[PDB]
Fold this protein.
Amino acid sequence: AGAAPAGGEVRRVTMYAERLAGGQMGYGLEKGKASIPGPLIELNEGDTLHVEFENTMDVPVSLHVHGLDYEISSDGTKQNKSHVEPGGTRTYTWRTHEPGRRADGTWRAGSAGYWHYHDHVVGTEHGTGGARNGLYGPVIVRRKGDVLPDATHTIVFNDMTINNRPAHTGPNFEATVGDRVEIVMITHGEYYHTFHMHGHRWADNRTGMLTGPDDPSQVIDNKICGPADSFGFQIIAGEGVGAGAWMYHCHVQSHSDMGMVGLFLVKKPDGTIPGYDP
Amino acid sequence: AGAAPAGGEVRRVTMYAERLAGGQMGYGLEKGKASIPGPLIELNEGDTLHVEFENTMDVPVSLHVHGLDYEISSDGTKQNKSHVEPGGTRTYTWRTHEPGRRADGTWRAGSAGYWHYHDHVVGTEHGTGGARNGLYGPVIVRRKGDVLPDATHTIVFNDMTINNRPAHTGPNFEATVGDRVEIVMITHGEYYHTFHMHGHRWADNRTGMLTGPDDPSQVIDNKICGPADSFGFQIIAGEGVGAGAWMYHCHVQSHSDMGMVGLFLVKKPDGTIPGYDPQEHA
Amino acid sequence: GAAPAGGEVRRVTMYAERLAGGQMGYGLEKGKASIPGPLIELNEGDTLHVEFENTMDVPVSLHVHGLDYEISSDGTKQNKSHVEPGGTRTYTWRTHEPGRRADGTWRAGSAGYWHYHDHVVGTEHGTGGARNGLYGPVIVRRKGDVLPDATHTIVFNDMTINNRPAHTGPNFEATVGDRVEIVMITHGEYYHTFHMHGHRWADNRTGMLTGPDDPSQVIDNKICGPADSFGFQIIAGEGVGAGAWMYHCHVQSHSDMGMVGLFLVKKPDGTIPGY
Ligand SMILES: [Cu+2]
Ligand SMILES: [Cu+2]
Ligand SMILES: [Cu+2]
Ligand SMILES: [Cu+2]
Ligand SMILES: [Cu+2]
Ligand SMILES: [Cu+2]
Ligand SMILES: [Cu+2]
Ligand SMILES: [Cu+2]
Ligand SMILES: [Cu+2]
Ligand SMILES: [Cu+2]
Ligand SMILES: [Cu+2]
Ligand SMILES: [Cu+2]
């Protein structure tokens, strides 16, 4: 496929927090276009992102990010006066760095990985109301040379829902056999979960794939996660197994039974999915 | 003793789902011989396994496997009509592959690992009643060169039970100091747990053993696990610690207090276990 | 600095003592018990004989994770190595280096972030003892391991941090650029997720990537359950600057009900802007 380049660009983007239907709340890149989860932010190690944020809502909101470099004034917490009053604006700055050798011979780990942002002030000073309402989104930081996927799908286990959706309503994702598909998997709220995919597996490391025959990372199809965990992987759709409606679900038994299930709909080249009948 | 050879053979096994005493259900390789946990299935990477499956019960049942390759017709779900009606039969096919490089340059991970199979249709569309009743078992897929154990033991944290056994009834496993002992650990149901072993430790990687001095995997004696998690390891029994009645238990405090505990009985060569009074462990 | 090779036989006295408010703790001298207990540090190959005294009116024990101990140092009533009220016992912990065995396999060393705790107070798995505060960290270093400028232990004990009242920390101070080591232990009934604002670490033995070839995930959030232990080292404020950097359990209601603390990273002049 493609390969991520070396980073180092200074980037800008506008972001809004807005109310959505039925007490929900979401982030968006354009007014009236908020979504749960929020827009995918992608950066290359070295990039700087200035987020020109605006709160269109009637209550304070903030933007807090995992993993990336930010100064304390972009913490997005009320305690550090980094929240945004109703109608207010503020520029959050996120920075990223390459790995490299420190002066003392140690190895500084880079920014790359599967990360996320979310509100930190709605409902409580820890964003408990903001997370419930839908104020979360994925951030991917790529290392130079990372393979780029054909498509990227974000799955958020938010309490007992997926992406704040009604029970038993997916979401479903479509691919064709051989597609390189990237899953970003984020958890929020109160519960632990176990994320599981039928017919596909991945390595429990940074990229979700073994670096080669010297990489001892476990290969899994079932992963325990809890509030604010994030991980990701790339799989080849239908590799070794073929086309079909491949279930993904939380494997906590009452959780799948109550509707934390969706489908990885993998099609043959002719567009068919053998045996699928919803 | 020994090492795993290269896979590539086409293997076949018969499997039966059967009701067992106490309202339980289990899988077995021979009729009337079901067990909880189900029979240990071991394959070498590259092997194919045809499972000739018969449901001897009055309710639909299925066979769903983690980790291994299978086409959608062997998914073992009602939704894809790969369940088995009462009294019915079906052949499930599991395949496995060796690691290698893709044309796009990336590494395709092999199937090797500590995996497991279980029912997917008893009680609910996700097998909630089936796993609770005992329809679960272990699958080990070995990579060429993997070290082989002197014995393999399977420990399943199924809800608040170990292997569906009553509280404070084990199971216990015996070995002799120096034995290479393999543990397969699987979790099912509703609850997270933490598996702990006294006197022994393992690496948090595929085999549970470090490859050599360049493996940075954390070495642990306590591992959080949730429903359908599976991992495994090998330990040298008593290595650097000696014989004795070595406890394993869930380390969630109320869980150990309520009976999620067992004993790794490591014997001296003369068959004796120092300091082991069984009634003091009751 | 860097860790030397181990191999020394050490001795130390340890006491179990009642503390205020129904609590209990370990200490190295009488009247100096603390929660969490004293940090025990060893180099792979060291032996530690713990000369243990129970100054309490109820039986107590000492049980350790990860280190090599014979069955007589199990610290369990079940194997009769608990300590009656007023009694004394010597517990012996050993450690070893990694190396190749005869069969050709690689024997894992003792090095890592581990912990000790009681096994007999309240129940025969020490449920009361952990709750009351009988726990503490153990670090076993491999030769050449980087040494930190300071070490702080964070224990998530049920819904508390280090048995502290809700929302009262503990707070830890550092200066921008300090090499700070965290030992993170969990006890009790609940799973948690440990999170630090402004910093990240590697999910491996040392919390540091060995170099460009280590594929471990870099994380700032980690799920942990009872008796899990892990540790890491971070450069305080590296790339982010001074500030009152929050750490907390990320299970939402847990941070709301008290599992929050501050990593107070100062400028070289000792000030924290905006705090
Ligand atoms: Cu769940
Ligand atoms: Cu499955
Ligand atoms: Cu967060
Ligand atoms: Cu499933
Ligand atoms: Cu448990
Ligand atoms: Cu222990
Ligand atoms: Cu499953
Ligand atoms: Cu124990
Ligand atoms: Cu918590
Ligand atoms: Cu954060
Ligand atoms: Cu936070
Ligand atoms: Cu313990």
Summary: The two ends of chain A are 33 Å apart (CA to CA). The first helix of chain A runs from residue 128 to 133.
